[PDB]
Each structure stands twice: as structure tokens, then as C-alpha cells.
Amino acid sequence: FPTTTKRLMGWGRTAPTVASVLSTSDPEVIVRAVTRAAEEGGRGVIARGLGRSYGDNAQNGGGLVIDMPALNRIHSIDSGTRLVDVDAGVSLDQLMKAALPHGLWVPVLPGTRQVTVGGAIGCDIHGKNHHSAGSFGNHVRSMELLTANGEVRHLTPAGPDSDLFWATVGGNGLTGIILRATIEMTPTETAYFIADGDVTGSLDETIAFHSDGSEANYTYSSAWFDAISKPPKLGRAAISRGSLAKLDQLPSKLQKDPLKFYRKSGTYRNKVQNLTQFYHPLDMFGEAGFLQYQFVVPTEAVEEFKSIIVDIQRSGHYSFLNVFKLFGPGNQAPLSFPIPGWNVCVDFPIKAGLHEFVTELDRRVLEFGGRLYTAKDSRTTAETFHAMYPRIDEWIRIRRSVDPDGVFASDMARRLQLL
Ligand SMILES: Cc1cc2nc3c(=O)[nH]c(=O)nc-3n(C[C@H](O)[C@H](O)[C@H](O)COP(=O)(O)OP(=O)(O)OC[C@H]3O[C@@H](n4cnc5c(N)ncnc54)[C@H](O)[C@@H]3O)c2cc1C
């Protein structure tokens, strides 16, 4: 085993640990890494992708961490079936580039493309198109999961160990190492969006804006809101909504290569945009000076959702950067973050009182029927987490089925009692 010793941290740059990291482009060397741990039984193993998760789910202090990005080969891309067969360490960035010439679009994109296929599945990631496309797990056809008995299992969403499939989706790697997957891509005639922009003047307008049925006219939607001004301005937002452009909707110059790659206001229509124009401000979150916090509360819990936003602004913890989105229906994964409702990611300068205020937020999110997102948590308690996810015991049951001895472990699994 080629291993080096590395100090590791998540994107939040908090709670670093040291571990042994194995990188290899050979799946075989990883299967062997697993069996020598299913015998050693020290602190366990965890996969790590590109480490874009904020907290501590992709590290294992004094354990073994597998550097999955080294295992980044694309096996095949088929315009016909729309299927793409990929090592788990392939970037969505790498994948999008390889797939674009074939008229194929990564079906769920987060705000950064430096995420592996494996981490996308591990956190069941969502994008601006959640209300139309659900989360990344919804698009997975199969995965090969290396389990603690050193076996590589072929898993599918409906099929024999379907429950295992769904506990892996959003399982934060605690089910075993995903080595390879087949994703069903989205067909596109173009690499561009056609987008509408709008600005609201308050929280209540922001909410009404999302609640008229409008969202059905766009496959992609999100908003950046003001969380610093006092009502009536609190919650005013710049909304950006769009769908992938068809070839006949581009200007002729872009119609040349369609699969490539007055004051400017937040108000505009039928504007042609590429991915990075269209995805602002979602890309710029992690640039430990800042604590990110993301929650969703159910659609019906409107006054309760507004009350969170009101309290944030009263607290004096100022988040300049954020995101607001209305999620659509969730999937079958027991620990998948998204449920229908109001989703917000906020970004607070760390200072006296922050951690305590966010504990207060947790209790409210929890009280209102909502949850926190593991990809963005460095911080919450095991007890709150378990209460936010009513299917957690079911998931722990599956988890133990497949790793009775605790071969797969992370700092997060300890912190949140997932083992
Ligand atoms: C700037 C920025 C913007 C973001 N925007 C969004 C967004 O819009 N929506 C969203 O949902 N998320 C967003 N995220 C979160 C990010 O998409 C997730 O944290 C994703 O999991 C990170 O992928 P990664 O490859 O870096 O995984 P890591 O962070 O390295 O891993 C995260 C989890 O996946 C597991 N994992 C990784 N590889 C494997 C494998 N082969 N097998 C099993 N498990 C594995 C890990 O063990 C760990 O538990 C954002 C993050 C950043 C920094």
C-alpha cells in the first residue's frame, strides 16, 4: 500500500485530523485496503472525494482514508441510452466536459463542479433544478459498492439490495466505498440556459414569488436574498430561473458551437447564459473565517420559516452570501437531505456567540419539521441530527447489516453517532 500521512480538513477548514491516505488508480489496491482493515479492525476506513464537504464526513482521524480522485476514469458515454459509466473519483467537471460533445448534461449540478461522482452520491447532492429533477441519487442507475467483507456489490435503485442502494445514497460513505457507477444523463441540444431574472422587495414577496405555480415554468431556480437589512427589506431577493436552451433559441454565433465548454439589473428575460453566469452566487461559498449553515423547513411551515430569517437578521450575525430555493419532492434514501420546502444556506463570519445561535437555529429547524444537510455540517449534535431524520434507525440497521464490525468510519459518524 502506497500511503502517505496527511493532515485532512473539510471545506470549512475546521477540526483537522491526521490519517493515512491511500491513493491508487487501481480498484484492486482499494479492495485489498479494505480486507486488511476488516482484519486489523483499527479506526476504520473512509472514502474521500475532492473534499468539498464542509465538515468532517470524509476524514477518519488515525484511520485509513482512500483518495478516490486518483480513480477517475470514464469507462463509457452513450448518447443512445444516455448512460455514462464512471469511476467514483471522476469530477462532475471532468464528466461534464467529456459528456457535452455527446449532447449530454450532468443531471444534477451543485454550485461547484469539483465534486466526485462518489461524493455526489455520498451526500445525495442537489442543485438549482431540485424541484424538477430531484437530487443526484435519483439519476443513479447502478453503483459498485465495495463492502466491509471485501465484496464488490452491484446495486440498483429497484433490484435486490435496493435498501442498501438507498442507504448509500446520502450515506456519507458509511456503507462502503463506491468504486464505479452508471449515471443516467440528461439530453440537451445545448450547453446554455435561457434565463429570467427578477427582484423582490421583501421576504413576503420572495415567498409569494415562489408560491404562485411559477416554478413549474423553469427546470432551474434559485435566489440570493438580503439577510442583513431590517424588515421590510429583509428577505428581498434576486431570483434567477431558467431552463437549458434548445438549439433554435440561441443566437447564430452560439448556434455555431452549441455544446461548447443602461444598467445591468436583476430583472431580465429570455437571457442566454452559460453554466457559470447562470449559477452565480452558488460557486463562491467557501472563499475557518465563515461558518456555513444549510437547512430546509417544510413548505407549509411558512411563518416558522420566516421566523428563522427574521431571527438571523436580529441576531447581528451577518450573512452577505446565501441561497434560497424551493425544493420539490424527496427520494427514498433514509438520510437524503432534501424534503419539499424552503431551503436556505447562509454564511456567517465566526465570532462570539455564533455557535450558540446556530444551536438555537437547530432547535427551531428541528421543531418545525426540518433538517440540516451533512455536506455543510461541521457542528450539530448527534441528538439533534437523529431527531431531524426520522428514518435514521432504519438506516443504522442497514448500515450495520453490511459493516457489522465498523470497518467504515469517519469523524462525522463518531460525532453524530452513525456507527
Ligand atoms: C462552493 C461549494 C458549493 C456547493 N454547492 C452545493 C450545492 O449547490 N448543492 C449541494 O448539494 N452541495 C453543494 N456543495 C456540497 C458538495 O456538493 C458535497 O459536499 C459533495 O459531497 C462533495 O463532493 P466531494 O467529492 O468533494 O466529496 P467529499 O467531500 O470528499 O465526500 C463527502 C462524502 O461523500 C463520501 N464519499 C466520497 N467519495 C466516496 C466514494 N467513492 N464512496 C462512498 N462515499 C464517498 C465521503 O466519505 C463523505 O462522507 C457545495 C460545496 C462547495 C464547496
Is 54 known as a binding-site position?
yes
Distance CA 352, CA 36 (A): 45
Nearest to 133 by CA among 32, 10, 206, 218: 218
Ligand 1 contact, 55 CB (< 6 A): no
Rg of the chain on CA atoms, in Å:
21
Alpha-carbon distance values, 400 to 44, 119, 167, 394 (Å): 14, 21, 11, 10
Say how many Å lie between the CA of residue 303 and the centre of ligand 1.
31
Residue 99 and residue 77 in contact, taking contact as beta carbons nearer than 8 Å: yes
Determine the residue of 52, 331, 412 to mutate for testing ligand 1's pocket, defined as the one with the most ligand atoms within 8 A of the Cβ atom.
52
Question: In angstroms, rounded to a whole number, what is the distance separating the alpha carbons of residues 228 and 217?
Answer: 30
Candidate of 57, 96, 115 to mutate for ligand 1, largest count of ligand atoms within 8 Å of Cβ: 115
Measured between alpha carbons, how far is 230 from 25 in angstroms, rounded to an integer? 53
Dihedral of CA 29/30/33/35: which sign? Answer: negative
Residues 6+ apart with CB under 8 A from 207: 235, 302, 305, 306, 342
Phi, psi of 338, deg, nearest 5? -65, 135
Helix (H, G, I), strand (E, B) or coil at 246: coil
Specify the resolution in Å: 2.1
Calculate how far, in angstroms, residue 51's C-alpha sits from the geometric centre of ligand 1: 7
Question: Which residue segment(s) compose the domain that 184 sits in?
Answer: 1-419
Domain total for the chain? 1
> Residue 335: left if φ>0, alpha if ψ -120 to 50, beta else—which one?
alpha
> Distance of alpha carbon 329 from its chain centroid, rounded?
16
Chain-centroid distance, C-alpha 401 = 26
Instruction: Let me know: does 272 contact 191? Beta carbons within 8 Å.
Output: no
Distance from Cα 376 to the centre of ligand 1, integer Å: 9
Q: How far is CA 89 from CA 10, 25, 71, 106, 178, in A?
A: 17, 9, 5, 15, 9
E-state strands within 23-73:
45-48, 64-67
The phi and psi torsions of 399 (rounded to 5 degrees) equal -50, -45
Residue 101, Cβ neighbours under 10 Å: how many? Answer: 12
Distances from the Cα of 405 to the Cα of 39, 110, 149, 224, 272, angstroms: 10, 34, 10, 45, 53
Distance between CA 367 and CA 356 in Å, rounded? 17
* Strand duo 17-22 + 3-8: pairing: antiparallel
Give one word for 237, left, alpha or beta, with left for phi > 0 and alpha for psi -120 to 50: beta
* Residue whose cell numbers read 417544510: 298
419 neighbors 404 (Cβ within 8 angstroms): no
Q: Containing H/E element for 107?
A: none
Q: How far apart are CA 169 and CA 157, in angstroms?
A: 10
Please give the grid coordinates belonging to residue 301. 411551515
**Which phi and psi angles does 70 have, rounded to 5°?**
-65, -20
CA of 321 to the centre of ligand 1 (A): 20
Q: Is 115 left (phi over 0), alpha (psi -120 to 50) or beta?
A: beta
* Residue 52, C-alpha cell as written in the block: 468539498
